[PDB]
Amino acid sequence: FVDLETGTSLYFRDTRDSAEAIAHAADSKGIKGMDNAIDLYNEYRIVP
Amino acid sequence: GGSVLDRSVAVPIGDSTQVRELFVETKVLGVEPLQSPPSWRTPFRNDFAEERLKELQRAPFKREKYVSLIQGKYTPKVKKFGYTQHTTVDDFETKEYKDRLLSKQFFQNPQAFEVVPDRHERSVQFGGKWEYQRTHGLPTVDRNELENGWSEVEPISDGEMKVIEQALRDISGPRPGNFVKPPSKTKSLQLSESWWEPLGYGWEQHNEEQKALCDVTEQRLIDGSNLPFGGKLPPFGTSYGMGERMRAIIEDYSKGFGLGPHGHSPTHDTIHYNTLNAEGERVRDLGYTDALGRLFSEKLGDRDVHQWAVESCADGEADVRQLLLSLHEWRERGRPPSLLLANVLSKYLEEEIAAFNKGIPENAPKLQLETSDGTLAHSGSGGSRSGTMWADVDPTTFALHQASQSTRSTRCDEPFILHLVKRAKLGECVTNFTD
Amino acid sequence: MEVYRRITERVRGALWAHHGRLMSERQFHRILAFVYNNKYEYQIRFDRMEVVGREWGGRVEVVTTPAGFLKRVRVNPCVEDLTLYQQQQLILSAYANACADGRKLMEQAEMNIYKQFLKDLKPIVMGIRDNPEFYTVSENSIETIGGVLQTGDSNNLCHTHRTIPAAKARQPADEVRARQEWEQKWINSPRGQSWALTLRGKTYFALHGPQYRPRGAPGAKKETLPLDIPAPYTAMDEKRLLKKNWMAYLDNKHVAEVMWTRVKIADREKRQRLLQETGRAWHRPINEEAINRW
Amino acid sequence: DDSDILRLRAPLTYDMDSTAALHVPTHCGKASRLAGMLQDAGGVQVLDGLGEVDDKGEPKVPPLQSNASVPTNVSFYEMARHPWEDRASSWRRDGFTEGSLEYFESQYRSAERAVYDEEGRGVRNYWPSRDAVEGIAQEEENDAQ
Amino acid sequence: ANRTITGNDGRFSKTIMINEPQCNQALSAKTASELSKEIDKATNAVYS
Amino acid sequence: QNEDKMVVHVLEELSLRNDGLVMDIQYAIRENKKNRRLRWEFVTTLLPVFGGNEAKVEQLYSDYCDGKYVPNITVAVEAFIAFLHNATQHPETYSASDYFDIDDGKSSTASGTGDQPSAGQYTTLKLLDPLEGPFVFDNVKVEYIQTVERFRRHGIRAGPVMAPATGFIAANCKSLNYFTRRQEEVVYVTNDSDQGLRRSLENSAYHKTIAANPALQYLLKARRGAALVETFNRFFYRTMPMLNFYQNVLKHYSETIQPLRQAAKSSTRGLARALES
Amino acid sequence: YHAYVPKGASVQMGETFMPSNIATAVFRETEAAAARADKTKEETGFFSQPRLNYPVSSGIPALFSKDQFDMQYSLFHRDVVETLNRHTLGTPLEGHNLETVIRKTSFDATQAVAHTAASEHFNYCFFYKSLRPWGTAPPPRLREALQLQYGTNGSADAMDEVRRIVWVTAASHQERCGWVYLVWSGVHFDVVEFPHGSCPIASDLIPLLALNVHESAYILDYGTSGLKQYVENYFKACNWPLAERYYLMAIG
Amino acid sequence: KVPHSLIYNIYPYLEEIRRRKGMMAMHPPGKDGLLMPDRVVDNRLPDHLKRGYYDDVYWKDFFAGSDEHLNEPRMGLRGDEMRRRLEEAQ
Amino acid sequence: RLRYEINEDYKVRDELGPELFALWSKAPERWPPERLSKMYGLDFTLVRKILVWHHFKACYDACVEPDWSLPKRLFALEWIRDVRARKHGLFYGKMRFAEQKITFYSDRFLFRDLVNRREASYANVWEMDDPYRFLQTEQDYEDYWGDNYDV
Amino acid sequence: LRQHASLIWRVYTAPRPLMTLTNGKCRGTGCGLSLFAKYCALKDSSEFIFDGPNVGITPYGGMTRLLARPETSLKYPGLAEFVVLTGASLFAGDALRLGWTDLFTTIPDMTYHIKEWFDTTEHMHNDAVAWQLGHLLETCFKMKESHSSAMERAAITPTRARWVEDAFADQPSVNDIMRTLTEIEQLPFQSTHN
Ligand SMILES: [Mg+2]
């Protein structure tokens, strides 16, 4: 997954609006939630 | 003490007489309550007299040499980070804290505090079986001083911020070696393992480097035939897996990273780099060389480099070692020439540069050595400073390439004519043979 | 969280990209941990104070800690006659303007935190670019197996900047030592002697003398020379790993490489967006030779 | 009429248009939560003449003021700082024991001014005698003694 | 409860479909306040 | 001739015996040429003296960059005066661009200097912030900044805050530049030895319109008669930083040159006898 | 972002110098560029121009200004290729090598279009591949070969002599439409002059160096009388080592 | 569906949802964390310049046997250490 | 035969000096497990485990006795789950995986609690994480302290 | 009003990725609902009508913001006044050129394919998620292949842009706008400027 560059742009989608990602009105800056790593080592394990 | 809490204790100024005779001006500001001075400004609560007496009694010891009583010990001892033994910082430790701590430590075990320790064994305890609840941890600092007493932080301006993030956006620009790793920097693998050394890993590269850049009097040549697999990677299913983990290590260490000229990773899904050695050929036909390089190697001709250096410097001109160094690093290991070497070459080669420059149309690139701008990087001049077509070339590759041109003598140190006769009769195919 | 972790990954990645140094996972997380705890401290102290939002006239008052917690609500009996719906909306809008004021405060606080954080990164960052071997090439210059090709256009437009004095090294440390030399020179002068008896002088000595801090008082008790971590000259996490187990070596270098790539991709995305906003770039690929022809 | 469109730009009061301001994100999250928060605060307080101005203009029932200010002593980097050296960084460094380092540095200094100028003439020599290179410092022996 | 909003869930994906073909998909106050529930309960789901 | 040198002669001679030093001088010169700020300062300072074409002022700016121009002390003095005038008549442009320190009436103590420092006056002539100033490398720029602020805030007069005394071309001397050997062409305005700044001020046609300003009254007359000297040197440091720059270049040259020639001859003869042997 | 930026434009740093007017004009030029890109994607034939190994955004050093070389590359050569594509589709020559187009169209009047375009395509290609921007010094082995033929009792006399014979050959082709090649006959070297619409592969030689003697090549820079100067400069900018490895491959 | 046994893994996530109120939710105004390169920086030096460049900061002959950091790896070396290299070569 | 150890990023040698011991020593209440847990890039169970070990090492280092209630405090949820499991299936020990309920929750099962958490608010930060927020009813307090006959 | 506005906000702040497939027309608050999702796809049928001064009211749905971005003033000066004053429909091409969204597709029943694609996916780790989502986007919704400028549906096709900027750009009233317009209607068929 990591090797194929594809989808890494998506960590950074907040960049799509320039004057916003500076302003920080929306709390969601990241793929799964509030930031890109909130819990890296915990969340994903909820899948069997 | 910078702080709101850091005001002092009650101090004497004398009777009305001495007060009027002390102060010249007095200006008053409105009444507000008395904050009790914190524990560290309080002289009776902070007295260190015992510890200071200990320091003084040991003070003459501090004036002598440090000497290891293991003779033949040189290397320093490592003190690690966060060990309690080594912590010198007392944030709130007053005499008060040190005493509360002392007492708690003493009633933990007394036998730590005896010069000759008696047997220390645990007995029962008076609070209960759960007594640790009323006992444990370290003495606690009062929370008022924890929160409020701290120094006033020196305000950071916007200037220093903009500087820091400028430096932050300087380092995020690409380094030329990372996307496609030079075969020269991928020979450098060493593991502490007992299976890594028996197989010379980078041997063919290292052999190439040695043969091209080193005199034959001093060179060590690794032979692949005697090496474990024949200096190769074994065929797939044969080697019991020695070969496979070999390949895995190599492919993982030699992989590139960062972004390439097409703006994508080397491993990116749909779009590719170096298709059918399309870059390999692009180096084949271009090659890495300055125009200035060959103008110099043309005018100098046969005669001795060192001789030339003693010539081009009259006695008072410049250190010979300097322009010798810079010349060597410019010719092989191709680099931008230092403005020393550029000044020398300018007043040396002026007629060859004139002759190279005399025909050119107006809007086309000329060849010029002028250092009026501070920096030497020949990506900075437009490549027009020297004759270079490249922004950067890694030294090893440059040296291999220009040594593949036969001009200089490395293995030709021998007698001249014998060298040339070996070159003619044995050809260059004499090294087809590995024996 | 996000703004920080992005910059820290920038640092880690760059650290391995430019020199062969790895940052220990321990270290990488403990940076972030320090940012976090900073925020926490600011919270601890922020809850001791209150912010007052007010709606119509002054007749709806809402007292709330800057974190957005609600402590009191005062109301005119006028409001009591409205409707449950409008009462609710009124109080809710007062609460909103309170949260607004609080959030203004907090955002100044956060700017302050960001500054401290940067200041703490500076010996590392300026550790890697302040060496005699560090360099960069322009992002638009082609890279080929030998080395990097020259960008052709506008031979005036490429200026190479240099951060280091090329003659004998003057390091930040020499500058701090210079600063305390001038401090002492000023103090020990006659005009400085008279100044040290002023209020300005004693403000200066209370803030910036550590040497006079009584034993057990919070804060550093000496003045510290600025940290020097020259990147290519200091082995950090790669040598311990290389001695112990190759596998962890390969994994950690892999992590650093991945992070660096990711950072670079982000920078490409921001660049692309800024390019589209100003209309120099289209909204779908119109130039495919810039991609497919490699 | 132009004056009427001039009027549109004024912010929402409750005196003119009888509607509260919209502010959207707070309404989005906390709209259903409000009863809870309110009763946690022990209900509202109905006071009299909160925003009602008196005869000469003075506030009747003086309004509540915010104590809030940005705390200026709170840098955490100086709170937890390096355990022996007092530096404020987050950087973990394993130092060497002071006094190991001192001795070490001393013997280096001695060894190097022994090698590079052995005769104490004062100038740097890159071609040292075999006796000065493989020779042991007598200071070591003297320290044992 | 009004059968205004309907849905289709795959393992890892979620489909929320607004069904009001009569008034030309114009959401009422109740239906909108409902959608802001289904959207964030679909979006804050674990497997989406 | 081996004695008298110009700045260009020095840089082209030194270009052989110090690579790094010259590389530095030149990088710095470039970065100073890039600032719009230093340009605007030079221009708007020297405009009143010539009063004429900004073409000549711009030319003189570019020539000033190379050491090919130093202002004549006469021109210097009347430029300073012209400044005091233009800043007083309409205060808005030159108190929002050129900086004076302002009095705090929140702070009051009894002294003759410190009271004129305390209420409604200009305390000090302020130098450019370290970002907009003359060049410093980005190693040290942070510590430089911190130091500048720490010192201005707490009223420390020392280091980067104090302005070095700049030299000018003497009244009798018609020479355009600095020279390595001739020291009498260059004239310093010191506290004790003055260049007639006072007698030129009082006899100037602007003396009364400047005497009008209550704020300038402290910088004209201070317990330290060095208020005028400090205002002067500070002004020409913040406006024309590169006079001190080149002055220090030549200073350093004349200091270190002969050791370098000894090293050169010794090493070259080393490889010489080594070679012929 | 590379894919999204049009063909000509350079991607750089904002200096915030743009007034809104020209800032909009730019977006409009980009829109047009997108349209013409969509039509060039469909106008694409079998053959195409070669990618250049060296940056030509500025001129070719010591030889061409930007306008000269880009009047060769983006004007004459691309026309040649449009012609070649127009006439190799709907014929037995569809989708074959550049060779098997050159060689199977050789010496016939009926297919003269296809052959002329093909050979010009090759010549231009080989010309671009024959230019190394800052020039190069001729390798020892090639010098040894050339000396055994052209050299008369002088050191690398073969180099001055070869760069003389090339000049003479160039001046002796009067029509100013064609090419001058240094080639290997397979038994010896020589400098041959090909007329426009003729190629060394068609005559089954092996090409080493190419020089473009079309008047359209030197007109913008050296004028109409400047051919000598032109050639002299060409040797400052030529690529010898290529000629060498081709020579050595020819021999074995 | 989610098994009852695996739900504990969601806990830390759910935890800092709860704990994200206040300053922890706050981002620095103006700063996205994505800093694009603008200029080009090269600090590289000719060898003779760096021979004595770090003498004051550290000892003289700082780059001595360093192969990566020098274009001439053997400069500054005293004779012995030069001899060592050949000694291991043969 | 013992030479390699998994997870080389955090070494036991390096955790001997406990982190920020000069702080949470002095007011251990202002330092809940969260503040420290941001320090480690490991999963939850592991980092709480490590924090326990830190506290104990620190205590033994300072020559005072450690809080033995600390492991119960950090793991409180696990504690109570084990107590109620022990009362349910009748056994003494620690519940393991085989004996967990087989209930299958829906995808969005956590929504109610999610909006309850997302909208929570706290007067101070101590209220935010106190150790005892796990407990509401009396049954909770009876399960949490059954061990100390003191409490 | 409050519930619609707050709904828009909900879509804007959604924690996990929320992809709004826009199939068919949007009136004002619907425009808001579709455009502010971080992943907003447009099919050919997608449409935006920001109107309501025609029903005697001011536009709602926040799209006003999008129309006022300095970007829109750069690319299409005057377009903001055109769409806000004149109730006028914008289409997929216009929403793409303005950079309101990155994503567009022509594939039938896209929703089914998204479903079945995310059925075959395996883990929840954000590496995996990032790639799966990203690959989905690149293969369909970004137009890498089989797309042209002739084919995208556009109201503002470039002559129209020139006209709009001649009429509505930088005019300090509605009145100025229509005496301008009135002066434009008057042009002959033979003038250069017609
Ligand atoms: Mg519930």
Side-chain angles (χ1 to χ4, degrees), chain G residues 13-252:
Chain G
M13 316 308 302
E15 301 153 359
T16 327
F17 80 92
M18 285 185 104
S20 195
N21 306 146
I22 125 258
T24 295
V26 164
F27 170 81
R28 274 157 199 185
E29 284 179 359
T30 289
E31 187 173 15
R36 78 176 66 101
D38 273 333
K39 85 176 164 185
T40 57
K41 196 189 185 186
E42 72 199 20
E43 293 158 12
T44 275
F46 188 84
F47 301 103
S48 60
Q49 290 190 321
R51 178 187 71 164
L52 297 175
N53 306 304
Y54 42 87
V56 220
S57 17
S58 183
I60 298 193
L63 193 65
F64 295 146
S65 65
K66 188 253 181 55
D67 291 345
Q68 181 52 64
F69 185 83
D70 94 327
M71 115 146 306
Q72 286 173 32
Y73 186 84
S74 58
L75 195 35
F76 284 82
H77 189 208
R78 88 178 275 250
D79 174 88
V80 164
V81 177
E82 291 171 2
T83 305
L84 169 60
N85 273 125
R86 252 193 322 271
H87 288 257
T88 23
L89 258 79
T91 184
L93 299 152
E94 293 169 21
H96 286 269
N97 263 348
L98 214 241
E99 249 96 1
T100 55
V101 178
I102 288 175
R103 238 147 190 174
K104 302 299 295 297
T105 64
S106 295
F107 312 104
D108 55 356
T110 50
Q111 289 174 21
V113 196
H115 185 82
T116 302
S119 70
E120 282 305 310
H121 185 214
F122 175 74
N123 285 331
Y124 272 107
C125 274
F126 199 91
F127 180 48
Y128 304 151
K129 189 151 284 281
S130 179
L131 288 174
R132 186 195 186 270
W134 287 105
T136 150
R141 275 178 296 178
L142 182 70
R143 262 191 299 101
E144 171 70 28
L146 294 170
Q147 174 66 211
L148 287 174
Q149 177 169 340
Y150 297 114
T152 309
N153 287 325
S155 59
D157 169 43
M159 294 325 296
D160 301 326
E161 191 72 354
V162 159
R163 78 177 35 106
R164 208 251 320 171
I165 288 177
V166 162
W167 145 243
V168 176
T169 307
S172 304
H173 169 68
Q174 300 162 346
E175 293 69 22
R176 308 174 164 190
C177 254
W179 306 83
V180 166
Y181 274 91
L182 159 64
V183 303
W184 175 249
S185 165
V187 293
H188 62 131
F189 288 116
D190 73 327
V191 174
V192 181
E193 165 262 353
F194 296 80
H196 179 113
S198 286
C199 135
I201 308 174
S203 58
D204 64 52
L205 303 166
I206 287 150
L208 303 202
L209 282 182
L211 172 53
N212 185 14
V213 307
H214 282 104
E215 200 168 350
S216 62
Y218 52 99
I219 261 186
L220 274 57
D221 295 343
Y222 309 95
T224 68
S225 60
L227 181 117
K228 181 165 190 61
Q229 186 49 258
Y230 168 69
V231 187
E232 192 182 335
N233 276 0
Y234 161 87
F235 280 113
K236 296 175 184 175
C238 87
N239 189 28
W240 286 109
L242 174 118
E244 196 224 11
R245 57 92 53 88
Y246 277 155
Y247 165 69
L248 301 177
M249 290 196 315
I251 277 192

Side-chain angles (χ1 to χ4, degrees), chain B residues 123-192:
Chain B
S123 163
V124 308
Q125 41 189 330
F126 281 63
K129 228 176 296 156
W130 286 268
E131 175 157 359
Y132 68 83
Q133 286 176 13
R134 72 188 69 196
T135 307
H136 80 290
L138 290 174
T140 277
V141 190
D142 80 309
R143 314 309 180 94
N144 179 49
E145 294 173 3
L146 240 199
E147 192 169 354
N148 297 322
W150 275 111
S151 197
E152 281 287 318
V153 191
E154 178 182 2
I156 297 174
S157 66
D158 304 335
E160 25 188 357
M161 181 184 52
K162 202 274 163 271
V163 167
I164 296 303
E165 58 196 11
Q166 169 68 257
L168 212 29
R169 77 178 72 258
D170 279 347
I171 69 176
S172 53
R175 201 184 206 258
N178 297 334
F179 182 68
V180 175
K181 289 185 178 176
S184 328
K185 285 73 210 178
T186 49
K187 70 175 183 182
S188 179
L189 234 192
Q190 300 113 342
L191 307 190
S192 298

Side-chain angles (χ1 to χ4, degrees), chain D residues 33, chain I residues 111-116:
Chain D
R33 289 315 181 106
Chain I
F111 183 59
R112 269 167 192 87
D113 186 69
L114 221 166
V115 294
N116 267 344

Side-chain angles (χ1 to χ4, degrees), chain B residues 41-282:
Chain B
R41 289 297 180 192
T42 292
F44 65 91
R45 172 192 267 189
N46 212 6
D47 274 326
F48 268 116
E50 289 67 20
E51 285 72 356
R52 181 135 183 65
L53 182 55
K54 247 169 252 164
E55 286 171 15
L56 291 176
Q57 286 165 354
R58 302 303 286 176
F61 286 88
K62 303 284 105 184
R63 295 138 169 179
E64 299 299 333
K65 291 181 193 179
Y66 280 103
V67 173
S68 62
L69 46 65
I70 306 197
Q71 82 170 14
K73 186 180 177 296
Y74 178 52
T75 268
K77 173 157 290 299
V78 166
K79 71 172 182 172
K80 306 199 61 59
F81 177 97
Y83 279 55
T84 304
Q85 349 170 353
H86 310 303
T87 298
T88 314
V89 165
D90 51 336
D91 256 338
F92 318 80
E93 306 186 332
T94 40
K95 183 59 182 173
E96 234 187 26
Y97 187 87
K98 278 320 173 181
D99 280 337
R100 297 203 280 133
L101 174 65
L102 177 61
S103 74
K104 190 167 289 194
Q105 281 178 9
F106 173 82
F107 288 109
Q108 183 52 237
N109 58 322
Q111 293 313 297
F113 286 79
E114 303 226 337
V115 168
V116 185
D118 211 322
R119 163 168 305 272
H120 171 270
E121 181 176 17
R122 296 180 58 257
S123 163
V124 308
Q125 41 189 330
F126 281 63
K129 228 176 296 156
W130 286 268
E131 175 157 359
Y132 68 83
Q133 286 176 13
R134 72 188 69 196
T135 307
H136 80 290
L138 290 174
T140 277
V141 190
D142 80 309
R143 314 309 180 94
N144 179 49
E145 294 173 3
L146 240 199
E147 192 169 354
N148 297 322
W150 275 111
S151 197
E152 281 287 318
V153 191
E154 178 182 2
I156 297 174
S157 66
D158 304 335
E160 25 188 357
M161 181 184 52
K162 202 274 163 271
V163 167
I164 296 303
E165 58 196 11
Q166 169 68 257
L168 212 29
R169 77 178 72 258
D170 279 347
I171 69 176
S172 53
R175 201 184 206 258
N178 297 334
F179 182 68
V180 175
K181 289 185 178 176
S184 328
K185 285 73 210 178
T186 49
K187 70 175 183 182
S188 179
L189 234 192
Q190 300 113 342
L191 307 190
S192 298
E193 306 305 321
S194 68
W195 78 83
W196 198 250
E197 68 261 11
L199 32 100
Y201 156 65
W203 72 271
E204 57 268 16
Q205 173 65 283
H206 157 76
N207 257 22
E208 187 44 47
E209 314 224 336
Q210 289 280 131
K211 285 192 72 300
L213 267 302
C214 228
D215 184 23
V216 301
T217 308
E218 36 157 325
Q219 51 173 35
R220 34 178 181 94
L221 278 72
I222 307 180
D223 42 17
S225 34
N226 314 18
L227 280 183
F229 297 99
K232 300 178 176 183
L233 302 180
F236 182 67
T238 67
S239 67
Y240 294 91
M242 299 194 54
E244 271 81 0
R245 99 164 153 188
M246 277 278 309
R247 266 183 215 280
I249 293 186
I250 291 166
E251 278 165 23
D252 183 61
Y253 190 71
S254 304
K255 69 172 177 149
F257 63 108
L259 295 179
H262 53 323
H264 292 253
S265 307
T267 39
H268 173 97
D269 193 84
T270 56
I271 90 185
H272 311 265
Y273 179 77
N274 202 181
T275 307
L276 294 177
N277 208 23
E279 296 304 326
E281 63 92 14
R282 187 213 206 101

